[PDB]
Amino acid sequence: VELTDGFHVLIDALKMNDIDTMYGVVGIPITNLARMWQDDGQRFYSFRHEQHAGYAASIAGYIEGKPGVCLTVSAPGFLNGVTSLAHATTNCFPMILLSGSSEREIVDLQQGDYEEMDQMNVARPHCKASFRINSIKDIPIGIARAVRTAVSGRPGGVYVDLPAKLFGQTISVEEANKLLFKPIDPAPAQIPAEDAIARAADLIKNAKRPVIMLGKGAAYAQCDDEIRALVEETGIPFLPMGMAKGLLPDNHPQSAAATRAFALAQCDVCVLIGARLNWLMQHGKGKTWGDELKKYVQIDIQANEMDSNQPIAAPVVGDIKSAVSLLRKALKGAPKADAEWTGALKAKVDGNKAKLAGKMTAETPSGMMNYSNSLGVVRDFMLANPDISLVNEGANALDNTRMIVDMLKPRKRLDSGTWGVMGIGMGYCVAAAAVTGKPVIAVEGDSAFGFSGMELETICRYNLPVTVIIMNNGGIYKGNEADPQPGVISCTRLTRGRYDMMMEAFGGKGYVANTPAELKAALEEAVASGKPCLINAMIDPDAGVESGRIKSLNVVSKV
Amino acid sequence: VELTDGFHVLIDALKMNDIDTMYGVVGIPITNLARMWQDDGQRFYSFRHEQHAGYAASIAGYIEGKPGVCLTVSAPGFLNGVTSLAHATTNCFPMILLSGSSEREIVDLQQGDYEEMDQMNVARPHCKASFRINSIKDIPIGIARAVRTAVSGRPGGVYVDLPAKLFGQTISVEEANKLLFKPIDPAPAQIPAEDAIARAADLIKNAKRPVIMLGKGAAYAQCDDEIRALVEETGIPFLPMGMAKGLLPDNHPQSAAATRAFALAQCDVCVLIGARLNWLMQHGKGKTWGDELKKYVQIDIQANEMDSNQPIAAPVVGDIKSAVSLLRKALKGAPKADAEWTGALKAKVDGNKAKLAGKMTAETPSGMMNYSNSLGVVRDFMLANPDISLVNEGANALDNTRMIVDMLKPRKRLDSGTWGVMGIGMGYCVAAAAVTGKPVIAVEGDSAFGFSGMELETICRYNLPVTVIIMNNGGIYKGNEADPQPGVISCTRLTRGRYDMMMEAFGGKGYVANTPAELKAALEEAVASGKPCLINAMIDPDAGVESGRIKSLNVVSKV
Amino acid sequence: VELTDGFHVLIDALKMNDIDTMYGVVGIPITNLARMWQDDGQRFYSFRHEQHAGYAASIAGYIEGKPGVCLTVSAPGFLNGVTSLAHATTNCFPMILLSGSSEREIVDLQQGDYEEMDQMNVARPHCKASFRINSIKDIPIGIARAVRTAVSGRPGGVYVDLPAKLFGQTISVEEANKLLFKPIDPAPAQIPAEDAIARAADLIKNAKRPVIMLGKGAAYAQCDDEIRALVEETGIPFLPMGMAKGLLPDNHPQSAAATRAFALAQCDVCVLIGARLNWLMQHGKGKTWGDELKKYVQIDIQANEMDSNQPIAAPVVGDIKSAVSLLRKALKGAPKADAEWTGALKAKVDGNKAKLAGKMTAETPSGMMNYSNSLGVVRDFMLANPDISLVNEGANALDNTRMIVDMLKPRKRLDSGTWGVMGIGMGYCVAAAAVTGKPVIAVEGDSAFGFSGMELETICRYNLPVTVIIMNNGGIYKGNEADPQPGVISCTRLTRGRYDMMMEAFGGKGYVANTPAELKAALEEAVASGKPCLINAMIDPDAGVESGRIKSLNVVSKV
Ligand SMILES: CC(C)(COP(=O)(O)OP(=O)(O)OC[C@H]1O[C@@H](n2cnc3c(N)ncnc32)[C@H](O)[C@@H]1OP(=O)(O)O)[C@@H](O)C(=O)NCCC(=O)NCCS
Ligand SMILES: CC(C)(COP(=O)(O)OP(=O)(O)OC[C@H]1O[C@@H](n2cnc3c(N)ncnc32)[C@H](O)[C@@H]1OP(=O)(O)O)[C@@H](O)C(=O)NCCC(=O)NCCS
Ligand SMILES: CC(C)(COP(=O)(O)OP(=O)(O)OC[C@H]1O[C@@H](n2cnc3c(N)ncnc32)[C@H](O)[C@@H]1OP(=O)(O)O)[C@@H](O)C(=O)NCCC(=O)NCCS
Ligand SMILES: Nc1ncnc2c1ncn2[C@@H]1O[C@H](COP(=O)(O)OP(=O)(O)O)[C@@H](O)[C@H]1O
Ligand SMILES: Nc1ncnc2c1ncn2[C@@H]1O[C@H](COP(=O)(O)OP(=O)(O)O)[C@@H](O)[C@H]1O
Ligand SMILES: Nc1ncnc2c1ncn2[C@@H]1O[C@H](COP(=O)(O)OP(=O)(O)O)[C@@H](O)[C@H]1O
Ligand SMILES: Cc1ncc(C[n+]2csc(CCOP(=O)(O)OP(=O)(O)O)c2C)c(N)n1
């Protein structure tokens, strides 16, 4: 005659869908779900703010391809978590945000309930679907919907609202076991038509100057050998987007990443694989594409992404593994890309890399490192230790790290993404550490870091093998902007503080690095320790430029 | 350097996407769009209310498989039209609502502009996507995005906001030539994996009492010979939903439609093809399905529709043509459905139809026909004249017509749909007439009809071959409900009026049919005439039941 | 031990708040509420579409100053009703939209429930507040909130969602009577500060060329003697907005309505009383105000309406009765407005009225009346019969009727309003007839009429003393627009049909008027009959201009 309850049926339902981890912050009305999650034997990571719990869930979805689960409380907690859900949806990362909510009777009459919000309706602009499980019997189906909505199609955020009265509901164990079920094939393959592939095959076979653009959807797809086999069999030069670095090793001879401007302006055919033609690509128009409409081949699971920005000549709609498998067989035996195109790009790549190596070896005063020589140490380390996640965010700290730090392994580089978010660092660190079981290095702008810095304590509390490298130049872009008025600090200034001391305040290992040699030693020691560390790398306050590579996007007064 | 403007570029862009028809109502700011559309040699149907121009667009989309286009004015006009957009999206009908909108400056500051509304944001819940084209250079891409969103994936409504200032913008004709383009493959094939098909084939193969449910998604797919070859090769009994009637001829030997309750309740495997397990299927639970969980196969283009209500043993995700084509090859040579199961349902169907024949053949007083003998006439007409669109809405008027009137051809029956909308009648009539160029018969409940009845004048003004049959029983369900108080008319009562006089008021032909013989002679004459007609079929006020077949869904006071 | 239920507690609660009338359309899940409303002895008006039920509720709120109550069904019915709620909110008319909705469990998981919609969340852009009563015990409080939100502050639409499961809930009679209560003072007076009034008093006392603008909020206020006493004591010339006609008799010697352009362009101080400076006033800027910022005094209950468009020099925030009472005492004994300002305007008024009388007496062919001589008959009739509601809508039909037809009594003229809505006519007629118990005349554009025409049957079914005058010129603005192509009708054309026949089809009295004399006789006979009548006034198809007075707002192609 045994009875179960809503707490347990939700635990069983999440387990049934292969969820063993949540990230969140406890409190009414969901503390005892968090407790019982752990009692059952599943891991819960408590954070210092729900936002960073949510950035954690978001990147766990990217890495694994099953939704990261974030757990928050009502109204204020939910709001913090849904800013992260918003982010997940924008980047196409599977993520379920679960939140407690209050009394339906009181919320609907807007009477002033404890943490009152229509969280279901507030979530809607920020996810693919916003649900609410009202009754115990619908938990399994409710969770199935959330998982399918997150993983299927273009993947993304789902919000599941959990009224406080869901949890204390009861049901027989025989009924619950009756209702509990595991979805068949929640992220199905979607195969494109033969003519879609043949139209693409035609454009590529006739290309004089082809290029392949790999985006983070391609990385997410987890079909690395087959994407690489496409590149190698076709002989086509390729470029990775920010988080597509390492999908093919960044030192692959066919990479044109070190000659991007030229390669994009001069190509005729451009093969977009899991890459939107959004602002990161200047919308497929302007001088970055030579002021012309290229012949775009585009592979994407989202049908209506095609023609979003420019006319796509060969739209291939489907999942990237399926599409790429067919395109390869379609291109089988075709001649390789033009040898004087591939040669021209390689000569540019060689030359630009020789030029960068010169900057990385240059000497600077103690405590006045620049971005080249500081990050040249991380470059060298990551070439030797590739099986490590690189978390990265900032302006100059992000741009220069993407240029300098070669990724040899896929799904390791985790950065600001589609929205250029400052705030993802410490959440990404916890999640990368949790889901990989391997070391994490973070290259943080100091401003960037301030958006999630308190989570240092969380990294310490779980004893995670994470090394936070702070690029401490004392401000946003630069740390030397003049006081606008007598004794008034500039808006872009930050305290050139002892972030190493802060790390040590919570049981972490703090370092200061005033030279490339000090940073090299500290990084090697930090990673090898297998312990929470922070390296306070001292960068020249005059080293950076305004907004890094995207300076031109700034609005300036001409009066 | 000759110039063109927004008016002409929009027209060209629409034409390039194979749109040649718009349904709407003119006025500030879009009257001169409609005129210029007509001047260019395309067709504009002006209605008496935008809702009906809208329902006209939605069903044009269903029948043609390219989106119907509704044009309306700002705030109030838009609102009227958006209610129809909502319905399209709910029914998976491709549709685009183009609405003029007011001044951004003024609307954004909520200052009280002419017909002030943020129509783009207000449209959000009622459509797949809600766009705005602010600039003349973005019209080709804006129209491409609208088209692709309406017809790709699960089809549905798209709203496109056309601010007043868009139209008077100018651009060189040469630059406009450069910007105009035709989307490649806007409604692409999506093919399922081998193992998804193999799982479904193995369910069907080992089924003891299988059944195929055909929904209006299977009808919409326009792969009638694939769907029929699957039914006939597998030997599986099938059942159509309201608008799937005629996809296979309703009198097909394998149809278990006339024995639905017993087939649904007793099947072990149920193959849903373009049919949601929503309220029309009692959500796959309850007495209707014998209080058990069936083994569902389900073919649908929308991945997250699976497990929406009940677990789906074999989910096959893709477009129905692609999926059915593959499933057919997988099952090739497999035994046909159990003979004692197909024959058992056939005996049930024969005896059931023989019972209905007796009801249709029976005799009633003059001016007091029932639903059987009145609609028995329309049944006979449509069997001999199947190439005619059948528009249908009401309670008893709908339910009984669905039962009685056999459809032998696909995409002819157009009814209330997923939301059970009273109001679709006269717009459906105008669009069916315009896109098919063939006759239409409408079986309208007298209440149903009053939601769109003023559009008789539209049907007359365009001289359309539409024969509206009003089932005039004098109210909602029944026309005899007693006066609740002395000299106070009940809320369900309607004037048992001369709808024939109303039709003739606008130049149409009117009939009153008091007997089956009078209805038959009027229908044969009306349909043969090729002119706008209305038959006022006088039905017994006491012939109906509460809410028809779904009378149990009513909430009653038990005190 | 007696039990009541949700149906009855809602009836008692509405009764308790002085509601004795609803307008709507029945069907699941609210038919038996409608039935029991009547059983109890309260009136229910069933319409042919929920939209017009809602336009009825909206104008019943304006007229009475207690919210009009509209009742609809779920999803599709709600949508139709909420287009009207939207309208109520925009015009500041108190109105409660009550709608049935479906199962919370199924709607929240978006599973496909009968008429599935989050109606509560869909309503939000279109009302002041959107509530949902989930439980029987909260009905009295739920209704109290709705009534207060509708009547208090700036009055407006409220949506109350009524889940199907609300109605079948039970409670003891002693509990229900315990919970049932009548709000104290739901539309409270709001008195402005002495300095607000003194700032206004200062501007008026120093005015060389003052004008008072009366809007429909002033009419709604129901303080006619005191508003008139302000005008008369100050000697200031005044202008009424569309529905403020008759607040003071339109033939008042101080009216500058017949010299509007001059009065507005030339004034220094402008006293806005319950009138927004929205598009109806060209936003307080441009040539209609002489290209200058006037010194505006503005009385409004909505604090943040001040400075919405132009800087307001003397903002007086409060309810108009309270404000006007204080301003009068503040102006007591002050000299009257400049005699050569008042004289100059009177000379213009006299002259322009003499000019209009000349057009009203001019002869036209049979069946080719113009707007002056046709409406000059209605003018003369309304001067003799002022205690009658004039419903009015159209382009030329509205503009010319506002100019020509003098209202001597307040809250009688009911027109298209802030949004210039075509669709309000027949609903306004039913409601005006219901709440006044007196005759109604409608002056309808023929296009205008088509948006609500089927409700003719509703007017007949309740035997209402309503006379519909159709201004039948055969189209939108004009009825003579050339066929754009061979045998293709223009988009602005309408059938010059026999709307008299349509009226008679439902038991009404139909007239055709081909001359002013025929229209005069028909109108006198129609009103005096006390019965549902329609007069099909035949207007010259070439008589009207594009969009009437607001022609310049049209967007035209210059290429
Ligand atoms: C928008 C964006 C995609 C544009 O790309 P980009 O910066 O112009 O190009 P890349 O970052 O790939 O490369 C930078 C330059 O270094 C060069 N380079 C790249 N890799 C190199 C390598 N390994 N060795 C030598 N040179 C290299 C490239 O050639 C390029 O210069 P080029 O344009 O003259 O060819 C990119 O700047 C970006 O992802 N921005 C994110 C900014 C953000 O969101 N942060 C927060 C906002 S303040
Ligand atoms: C909900 C719904 C799908 C349920 O299906 P249903 O009505 O029970 O089943 P059908 O309409 O297919 O068939 C009706 C009955 O007539 C019988 N029948 C069907 N076709 C027949 C035929 N041509 N000859 C003889 N009998 C027939 C069936 O056996 C069935 O009864 P059963 O339960 O004993 O088997 C259906 O009622 C529906 O589409 N409702 C829409 C109503 C609506 O929109 N309401 C408007 C607002 S009030
Ligand atoms: C926008 C609006 C407020 C502007 O006001 P307007 O039309 O310029 O001014 P009025 O309607 O009060 O008066 C019209 C003219 O007739 C004159 N007039 C008014 N009453 C008169 C009378 N009784 N005798 C003689 N002349 C009169 C006025 O002097 C004015 O002309 P003027 O500007 O040269 O002085 C007005 O046109 C309006 O309410 N429009 C509504 C349109 C709508 O919503 N319909 C649907 C849109 S198509
Ligand atoms: N499995 C998959 N197969 C194909 N496309 C995918 C898959 N997962 C995600 N996508 C698509 O990949 C794209 C990711 O692009 P974007 O986030 O812009 O990448 P980047 O910023 O790296 O260019 C999205 O358009 C998304 O629809
Ligand atoms: N071309 C297509 N291929 C596959 N599925 C489709 C296609 N077009 C529409 N659909 C699906 O068909 C379904 C229609 O179901 P529904 O509207 O409930 O039909 P019914 O009411 O007849 O059961 C939707 O779930 C939709 O996603
Ligand atoms: N009792 C009241 N006292 C004061 N102001 C009111 C009252 N009721 C409504 N109002 C205000 O009256 C105004 C009505 O203006 P509007 O609808 O633009 O009128 P018009 O169109 O006639 O100019 C609104 O701004 C509203 O806030
Ligand atoms: C939440 C959020 N706030 C603000 C910004 C704008 N922004 C871009 S980069 C940046 C910080 C740049 O400074 P830093 O992280 O120290 O990198 P640096 O250039 O100094 O190396 C900010 C605030 C943002 N992208 N996200």
Ligand SMILES: Cc1ncc(C[n+]2csc(CCOP(=O)(O)OP(=O)(O)O)c2C)c(N)n1
């Ligand atoms: C817009 C809208 N309003 C109300 C309803 C509720 N409703 C369902 S059926 C129906 C009409 C039933 O009467 P009728 O059309 O005459 O069919 P009958 O049963 O009398 O044959 C109504 C109003 C609805 N479905 N849609």
Ligand SMILES: Cc1ncc(C[n+]2csc(CCOP(=O)(O)OP(=O)(O)O)c2C)c(N)n1
């Ligand atoms: C719901 C809605 N649709 C469209 C319009 C645009 N509109 C303004 S007036 C008008 C009709 C004008 O014709 P009519 O009513 O016959 O008046 P007339 O000028 O011919 O006398 C229309 C459709 C509107 N205001 N509201």
Ligand SMILES: [Mg+2]
């Ligand atoms: Mg910095």
Ligand SMILES: [Mg+2]
């Ligand atoms: Mg009826």
Ligand SMILES: [Mg+2]
């Ligand atoms: Mg007209």
